[PDB]
Amino acid sequence: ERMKTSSEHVTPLDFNYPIHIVQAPQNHHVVGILTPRIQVSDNLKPYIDKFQDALINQIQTIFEKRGYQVLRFQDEKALNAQDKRKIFSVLDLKGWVGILEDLKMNLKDPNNPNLDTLVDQSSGSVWFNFYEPESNRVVHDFAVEVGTFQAMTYTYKHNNSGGLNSSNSIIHEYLEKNKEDAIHKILNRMYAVVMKKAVTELTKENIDKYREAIDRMKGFK
Amino acid sequence: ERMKTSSEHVTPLDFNYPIHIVQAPQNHHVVGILTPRIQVSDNLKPYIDKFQDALINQIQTIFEKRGYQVLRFQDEKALNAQDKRKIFSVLDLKGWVGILEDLKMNLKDPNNPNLDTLVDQSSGSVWFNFYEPESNRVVHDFAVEVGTFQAMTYTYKHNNSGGLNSSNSIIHEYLEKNKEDAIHKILNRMYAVVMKKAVTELTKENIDKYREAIDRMKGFK
Numbered sequence A, B: 001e002r003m004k005t006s007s008e009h010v011t012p013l014d015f016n017y018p019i020h021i022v023q024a025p026q027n028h029h030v031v032g033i034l035t036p037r038i039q040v041s042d043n044l045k046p047y048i049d050k051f052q053d054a055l056i057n058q059i060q061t062i063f064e065k066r067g068y069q070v071l072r073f074q075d076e077k078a079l080n081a082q083d084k085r086k087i088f089s090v091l092d093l094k095g096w097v098g099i100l101e102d103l104k105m106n107l108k109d110p111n112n113p114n115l116d117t118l119v120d121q122s123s124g125s126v127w128f129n130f131y132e133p134e135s136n137r138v139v140h141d142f143a144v145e146v147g148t149f150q151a152m153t154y155t156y157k158h159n160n161s162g163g164l165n166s167s168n169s170i171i172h173e174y175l176e177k178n179k180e181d182a183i184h185k186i187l188n189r190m191y192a193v194v195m196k197k198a199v200t201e202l203t204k205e206n207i208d209k210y211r212e213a214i215d216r217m218k219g220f221k
Helices: A048-065 A081-086 A176-201 A211-218 B048-065 B081-086 B176-201 B211-218
Strands: A002-004 A030-034 A037-040 A069-073 A089-106 A115-131 A138-145 A150-157 B002-004 B030-034 B037-040 B069-073 B089-106 B115-131 B138-145 B150-157
Touching: A002 A176, A030 A048, A037 A048, A048 A069, A048 A176, A089 A176, A089 B089, A089 B115, A089 B138, A115 A176, A115 B089, A138 A176, A138 B089, A150 A176, B002 B176, B030 B048, B037 B048, B048 B069, B048 B176, B089 B176, B115 B176, B138 B176, B150 B176
Parallel strands: A002 A150, A030 A069, A030 A089, A037 A089, B002 B150, B030 B069, B030 B089, B037 B089
Antiparallel strands: A089 A115, A115 A138, A115 A150, A115 B115, B089 B115, B115 B138, B115 B150
């Protein structure tokens, strides 16, 4: 996806993906969610906590709507021996997520071959697995690519004769808002595609894939 | 691509991609190559200098075989005003390249549904552009995805009845060699796909895309 940016208005962050699941009855199973470990580029460090916190809050609501109780844990090691015996399964999220800045590209418009652009470009991916902590049975695993978003920070057009002109003078000192807008729009897209994935994969059928065997092993009667 | 690993033999690093280009005559143009800026995950920090150094050395030989002289520069700012007037165009490489460790996945074998695996998984991408530094004319740009490689560090098989068994006890204290092997094999694959890309795109026709206009602007007679 390729998106324009603005020097006038910075697009607000909007880390929310509407979920429409009818409240199921309580199934008395408890699931754990570990703090995600998404490593990010330096430009994303001011945002990643807001991003992760929203994601975890929304994923928690998927499980709750489907009738599970949900507990949060720092990491795998935070589950003591009794926790592991009791918990149905645990969701772990890991990721490598970055935005590369100030890339110059030709726009690839055959009708406009003199148009080039300065872009920010996303890169990386996030990986989910839902596993039973005693046995390491993988109940469900899935992933999402997030390196598919490009925001044009500055578009320029060469003169028919080549050489220098007002457009192709790139002055970063005038682009601060475009560049903030780029990061915000990419973040909003990356949030939506991760959450769409989560909603699509965290279904009753996938969550319950090994319910009988897990409940037998754990003595859940 | 999904690859096995070994606890016996760590696959040597092999950052070399054979290039077969007949030495063209000297064209008296000079190109610049900037030090690449590939940001990597912490597990790749011991390797990235070796990786980048090899890539740059091989890309330099592509341009030289095609008849260009090649100069190296620290960054865009290292090109003084006279350098920018003289240099034909400059190649910049940026990337976001990581390996996520210890992911648990079901193997997706319908004939073997009890087989799960611990994997290292690559993630990210690298972005090339070749641009004329005075005008910012993008001569050629291209990119390569590198998040497509998975190395199985430990494969395990659940008993038909579920529960615990010798296989599904995951003991990281025994996996040091498998994990070193994983990183080395992924790095070798990522090198080969980046270099294949570079060879495919850094052709005489793409390098010379704006030769006349650039030479006219610069007074190259």
